[PDB]
Amino acid sequence: RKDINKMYTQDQYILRFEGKLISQNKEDNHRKFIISFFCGDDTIMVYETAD
Amino acid sequence: NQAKSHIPGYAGYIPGIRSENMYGKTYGKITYMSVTNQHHKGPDLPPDLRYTSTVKGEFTDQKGVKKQELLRQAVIEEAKITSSGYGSSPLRTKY
Amino acid sequence: MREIVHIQGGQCGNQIGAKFWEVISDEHGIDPTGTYHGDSDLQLERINVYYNEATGGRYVPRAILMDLEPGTMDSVRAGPFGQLFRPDNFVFGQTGAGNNWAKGHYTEGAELIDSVLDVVRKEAEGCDCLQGFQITHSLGGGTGSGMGTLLISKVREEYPDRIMETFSVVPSPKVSDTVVEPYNATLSVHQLVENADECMVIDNEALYDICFRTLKLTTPTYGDLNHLVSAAMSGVTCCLRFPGQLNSDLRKLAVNLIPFPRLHFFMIGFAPLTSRGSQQYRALTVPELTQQMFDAKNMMCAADPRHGRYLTASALFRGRMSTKEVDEQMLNVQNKNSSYFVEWIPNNIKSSICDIPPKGLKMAVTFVGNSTAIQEMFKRVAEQFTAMFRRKAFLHWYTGEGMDEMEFTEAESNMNDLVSEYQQYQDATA
Amino acid sequence: MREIVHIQGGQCGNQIGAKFWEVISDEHGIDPTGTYHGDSDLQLERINVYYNEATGGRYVPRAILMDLEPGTMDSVRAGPFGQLFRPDNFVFGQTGAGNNWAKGHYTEGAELIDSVLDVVRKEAEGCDCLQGFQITHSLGGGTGSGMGTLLISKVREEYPDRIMETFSVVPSPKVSDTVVEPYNATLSVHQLVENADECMVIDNEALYDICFRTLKLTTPTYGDLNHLVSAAMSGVTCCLRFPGQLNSDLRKLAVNLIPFPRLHFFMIGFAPLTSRGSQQYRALTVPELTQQMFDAKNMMCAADPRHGRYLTASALFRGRMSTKEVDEQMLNVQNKNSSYFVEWIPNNIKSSICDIPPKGLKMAVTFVGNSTAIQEMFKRVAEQFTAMFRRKAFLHWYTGEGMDEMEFTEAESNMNDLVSEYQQYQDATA
Amino acid sequence: MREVISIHVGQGGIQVGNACWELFCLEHGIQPDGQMPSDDDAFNTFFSETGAGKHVPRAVFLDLEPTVIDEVRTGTYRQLFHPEQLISGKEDAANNFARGHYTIGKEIVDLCLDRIRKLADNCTGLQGFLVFNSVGGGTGSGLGSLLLERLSVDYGKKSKLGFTIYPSPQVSTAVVEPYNSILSTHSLLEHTDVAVMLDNEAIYDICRRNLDIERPTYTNLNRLIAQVISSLTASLRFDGALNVDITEFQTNLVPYPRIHFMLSSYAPIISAEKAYHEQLSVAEITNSAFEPANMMAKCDPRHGKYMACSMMYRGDVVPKDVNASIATIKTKRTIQFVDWCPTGFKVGINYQPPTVVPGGDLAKVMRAVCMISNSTAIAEVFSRLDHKFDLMYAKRAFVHWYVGEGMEEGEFSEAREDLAALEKDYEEVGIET
Amino acid sequence: MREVISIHVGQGGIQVGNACWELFCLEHGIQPDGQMPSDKTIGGGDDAFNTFFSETGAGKHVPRAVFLDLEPTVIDEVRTGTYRQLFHPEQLISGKEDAANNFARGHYTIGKEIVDLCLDRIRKLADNCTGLQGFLVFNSVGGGTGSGLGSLLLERLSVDYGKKSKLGFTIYPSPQVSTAVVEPYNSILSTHSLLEHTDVAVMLDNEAIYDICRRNLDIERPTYTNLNRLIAQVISSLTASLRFDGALNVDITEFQTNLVPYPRIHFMLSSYAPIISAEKAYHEQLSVAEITNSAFEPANMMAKCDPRHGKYMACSMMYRGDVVPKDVNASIATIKTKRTIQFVDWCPTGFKVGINYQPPTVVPGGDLAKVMRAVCMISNSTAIAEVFSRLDHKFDLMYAKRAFVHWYVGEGMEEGEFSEAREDLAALEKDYEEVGIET
Ligand SMILES: Nc1nc2c(ncn2[C@@H]2O[C@H](COP(=O)(O)OP(=O)(O)OP(=O)(O)O)[C@@H](O)[C@H]2O)c(=O)[nH]1
Ligand SMILES: Nc1nc2c(ncn2[C@@H]2O[C@H](COP(=O)(O)OP(=O)(O)OP(=O)(O)O)[C@@H](O)[C@H]2O)c(=O)[nH]1
Ligand SMILES: Nc1nc2c(ncn2[C@@H]2O[C@H](COP(=O)(O)OP(=O)(O)O)[C@@H](O)[C@H]2O)c(=O)[nH]1
Ligand SMILES: Nc1nc2c(ncn2[C@@H]2O[C@H](COP(=O)(O)OP(=O)(O)O)[C@@H](O)[C@H]2O)c(=O)[nH]1
Ligand SMILES: [Mg+2]
């Protein structure tokens, strides 16, 4: 079963965040990412912007 | 109280359905617009309603349609919910 | 030592490699940032087979990704373990072939293949001791069916002594997502039969059928199909990366499975596979493994293996087990199914055992069977080809870009001759 | 060693097996999770007779459940001890036979039996040393009476040397639940007499009479009937699973109880049977056990055993006892009832002793008697069959699905000949 | 995985469909608005899941008179039924079987067949079709004949069972109803697998004698019929010790293909004022069920021989009591079975007790019985209807109303000789060897 | 990095371009002012809007499409409307005098003075883009200016760019309904012109969509706007594969390699499913099998043509939502097993199915509801010949007595240009019947 009511009622709601990674590697300690959360079905996605 | 608006395949009479247009919408909306009176009546037009032609009377705006549609849905459902209880329905006396 | 490189092209090749590398990464215990976090010492002794060492202690696959459109590679960059690929290997076009073999093989593919050939040559020269190449494609797409086979030809022209493996997804009419499937399939097979040292066909109809009846899962997906294909892919090369009682490299398989140089088309199978409901219910034993192995329904192809006779068979077991039981079970099966085995070549079954089982499973089995039952797919593909070719349908695109109908006639004649000579040995008697 | 598999079909057979396997699990100390929890060492020495090993140390009943409708199996799966069965052994149709022998034997059953035959062949090949097969079914249902007997014929065609046991529930004229019972009962008996090595008849009317008179319980139920049938079944094969003074396998019973190959229809009984309010006062002794095993009302068949002469009798005792007492009691019973025993074959009583009694009881007895009194059931069945068939009523149903009236005529003639030749030996004198 | 499709045509058909579906929705617990009140595939017997929330009954309504359809779609079940499966035409046949068989029904039967295809494509284990129709009415009769003859060639071997309401011997609303009743019987004789008697005066007597309502209505009739239907169908969606399927009616109860008219009784029928003061024993409820006055068909079982009866027992009944009651029934001398039938009783057992409807008359009972029988005594209704039709056809009254609507003059005749042949078939079957 | 350029001509063309353009903005989140919202200030990723837009560097997005008309009323309305800030001011090319249903006026008299600026604006687009996938053209054929300008644009573009792909969404006159009286003439002339100049043409007849609306949408008095919304949804679903991630992608160049077997035969017919309004949409599951059955149902067609009267060559179905590939293949198996729908002896496999993950977007004030599964089919079958035959009959009815001919004679067109169009249609009719026979 897929709870269809939740995706009907919460499709337009999307949360966009700005985040920085933390990792052992030092090359990718400064670069930035934009995260997106779609609460229609709890989907988590990451975008990498290149300056 | 009825329900306001009717099932699509409803034969019968829905008052001023032929007099004052209501062209374009689905059918349930027209029935609702007619059952709760939101339209001009009469063979005359005050200045404001006229000169609002299709692409100028509609096919425009933005999220105001969100607001009106949401209010219509809320009012129609709060009108409908006036029925409950573990006694089924009085269709014995409705029939 | 005796390492190989991975080369994938087209959407299907890229997506197949996407989870093949994921399965290999899970087996070898590498993190998505390239940091080793395994538990066993054997996980690092033969890591050079698929991974190159870099400064900082990280590893990179020898994978080369090609396409005439960049969308599929920009998407595989998003999948898990997609940050292991070396960015220079990504080679993409700016136009796309539009499912056209002529576009993907004559004008745009020929011009584009220069850089990818340069990088492939660099990779082949860099490695210590080259064993061969493995190439994965589908015959339902124009850019794949053209560019992949042209690169097969170019690589064969430069490395005649090395071995070549092709992972071919042929279009079957049941899962027909394109109407020009058989033009491209026949044109790709015509070039592939000449150059590919080994080819193994995979059918999406068979994949979905497996998913519904064997695993009994209601919603099969591209991910499940790719996972099954990747497990079957790793089952072949597990023994080259892990120790075993009887090692058998891809060259030994080529020696023992191909009687005649033009008969190198295979269908495979993987065991065990069961639903979550029967995982505790079932028991893992050699008889169960071999009975699920040799079941006609378990084959990775829609072709019925009981409609023909097996020319040869190859088995790769994973896990610690006695060799006597394996030998006696194979002898018992070969005695009980003598009607389905060719008679003029006795003992047409090869056995190989590796002591390292896959992660999460105690015993595993890979079957590769060369049989005459594969003729049905070619017969139906040729029937569709001649039906669509008798009225010259959709040939204006192909004739407007440099190639003519004489090549079509030659391809059809060669494919029909291949089918006839493949079925000739079925009726041969001693 | 010398183990047998279980196969059941139809709703009644499924219900019988649901209690038989529960009784076996309780006797062997097997929990509904398949985990051994017994107390004695002897409970595990010969558990391979009915249980196979799986990974994790769990045990499985190798029973194959078949039906043309899935309702009975989907209901028994949720019952106690229902998780022991492998899901792979469950085979069900989607249409149903509607209590019609034509649908159960010609149209649907012939096509459906392929999978159950495959799994039965797999189970028979898997076991170390096959002893035979046992089937439980009712003759009042069309789908069972067709599919079970067709499977009997198919299994006999493939294993002519193995032994066959059938537990047949025949529709008695007193308690009738289906109007077409005579037709399918005759059709099933006609095929069963040709292939069954042993058949044991069980009557619901006789079970209900036993429940009302001996146990004196207010409301008899299908659960109590299934429990009695399960105890009767376990009494036969107890000696093969447990040590005893004089072991006697099913083959020895077949040798000692069947004088002529076409006379293999038996009626059985179990002792002791006492009410819950009358357990203390009775003393478990060999004289009580024999006076109860030879009681007419203790028989699981409504046929009167004093209306004919016993051709042969067999008794299996459970519990530690002296053999001299058993022999002298058998001699006394045979001497005091010489009028009811055939005279031209002396010493027509066989006795077997097993040292392991049933759980909760100190001594027990299973009796199997081949006598000429069984002719009455066949006579009344044939009378009802000919009364219903003389007006060709209820017949277009069968004739519209491939059969004809000549098969019915042949079945009736064969039944009449069988009855005549069964009663011929009753009047034979030396 | 099992499904069945119900069709209701005519005013009587739609009114009995409402009564059956209210009982069905109550017993399955689904809300009148269609949403699950919240809490195992049993609802798949009559309903289909939309994926999330409400359910769809597997039923269709057909009528040319939109009054009843409008009433239904304005009632409390407006949200429950699909808007475009309650097909309503324009002009009623007005008791004229020719109007509904040759002029008007053809233009709506295509839409109905399209709807049947759409609903049947969803079902995968379709058991068969149930049809409800008033034969004493023109549009109902004509549409029933058309749908039966179309489905018989569209599907063929698929089972169809019809709960026909034949006219009473003396009490009727119409006067031209003999004509259309005879024509529809002629049509359905070779097109219906099972036909069930639902004459009105018999249930009228039942209600007066047992329910103790001196002034009941058609809705009480419809509720009793709904209880009968729910009983006969509960075996498919409720677990029982001895289950009976739809396919297990034409395999036990139709000795010859032409004899498929079948008459049904039910028990117990008692109001709550005295329902609890009797133990309601299985033996006495069975005796009441076979009692001739407890019949829902105005027929005398004493006047004819019995062929085959099937009882369903719902509740906590025990098979030992079942067989004990059957033995007593066979023992009684007032009921006799035909010579060539040694056993003719088919028993089914279900654990689910009947559900009581609020505002109804029937009380809550832990045991119930429904018996469906084939006996030779049915021929009297056919004989009297034949006399009724002959009295009119002697002087060719009312004939122009049928001639002018597309039928030829002689189409009454073949129906007449079909009834005659069916009669002589009944007497030929009824004689002993 | 992929782009597609849309051109609209005629008032029908402009009001269908506007209709697709609010839908594109809605599904891309574009406000009428060009900012995403004012509330969402991160952005800077998921570049897919470049399929129809181009970034201004900071803020708004501009359309990749052109509006053309010689009647300036519609362009004045558009530049007055709420989208006045969206389109570029100079990209709405408007003339002074309407052709007034005269194809001669629009092809020989007044279209030449405006087609130069049109081509200039086309080049001013093509220079900006780098991965142009192709061109779309929208034009009403029953109008002289639309037909003439479309023919002229196709003729110049076929030599200006050469091999680039063009798709034309034409709306031929109704079989027996007409709003004008001289539309057979200009329709036939335009068909003759575009036959060798368009790569693919698609049928968009009006009475078919009228029947669709009255039967499915239950709207007894629809207006043209609803038809525009349906066409907009169709083309948006068609282009969704190029801007949305899908496990089975299809490109614009993957169209006439799969639906056009001879270069002359390139007329396609489209059907959609499901079409249902909200008050009864949620009542059933809308299974993939039943939506595919409805799509292939003849009465669900957007062209007034009977597929049962003609022989099928090849069909392409495209799904958007959460569809399952094996469910798709099982539906295709049922379609093949069905008898009344037959595929030709020289085409055993004729299915081109594409899959996309993005569900269709619901429009405010529209007729359709929000669904998780949608199918659209584009088909080539021999049933096309009936509309051509009837149009030929109607045109012959007038050319027999030379009615209305002077209105084309006096505007630069010589007398004989009706002929080659007539024999062109006749030759295509024999070509259709020749393709339709089996070997
Ligand atoms: N038992 C029962 N019979 C009914 C009911 N409604 C109508 N009838 C019977 O049907 C007969 C007339 O047919 P109707 O049902 O009224 O109408 P119809 O069947 O749709 O056919 P037309 O008369 O042509 O409209 C009457 O004589 C009644 O006996 C009902 O609700 N219950
Ligand atoms: N479906 C649909 N068809 C339209 C629409 N507008 C116009 N048409 C069709 O267009 C045909 C006539 O052409 P028009 O679009 O009105 O005008 P035109 O093509 O610019 O040519 P002129 O009339 O000379 O200006 C009519 O026969 C209609 O069938 C529309 O909004 N929707
Ligand atoms: N295993 C698997 N096969 C796929 C997937 N997507 C498409 N295919 C198969 O690939 C073939 C089509 O290849 P195509 O995309 O046209 O190749 P391309 O033109 O090189 O991109 C079809 O036969 C599909 O069955 C997937 O996600 N997984
Ligand atoms: N002992 C016993 N007999 C049963 C049970 N259930 C049904 N029966 C008998 O089986 C007969 C009906 O068999 P049926 O269900 O038609 O067999 P099927 O057609 O193979 O499913 C009845 O006469 C019952 O007496 C049970 O649980 N226990
Ligand atoms: Mg205009």
Numbering used by the authors:
A (entry chain 6R): 410 to 460
B (entry chain 1C): 31 to 125
C (entry chain EN), D (entry chain DN): 1 to 430
E (entry chain DM): 1 to 39, 46 to 439
F (entry chain EM): 1 to 439
Paper text:
In this work, we used cryo-EM to determine the structure of native DMTs from the ciliate Tetrahymena thermophila and a combination of mass spectrometry and artificial intelligence approaches to identify and model proteins inside the DMT.
We optimized the purification of DMTs from isolated Tetrahymena cilia to preserve all the associated structures (“Methods”). The single-particle cryo-EM analyses of the DMT from wild-type (WT) and K40R cells allowed us to obtain a 48-nm repeat structure with a global resolution of 4.1 and 3.7 Å. Focused refinement of overlapping regions that collectively encompass the WT DMT resulted in maps with a resolution range of 3.6 to 3.9 Å (and “Methods”). Since the DMT was obtained without harsh treatment or enzymatic digestion, its structure represents a close-to-native structure. It revealed a difference in periodicity between the outside and inside proteins of the Tetrahymena DMT without any clear connection between them. The inside periodicity is a multiple of 16 nm while the outside periodicity is a multiple of 24 nm. In Tetrahymena, we observed STPG1A and STPG2 bind to the outer wedge and weave into the luminal space of the A- and B-tubule.
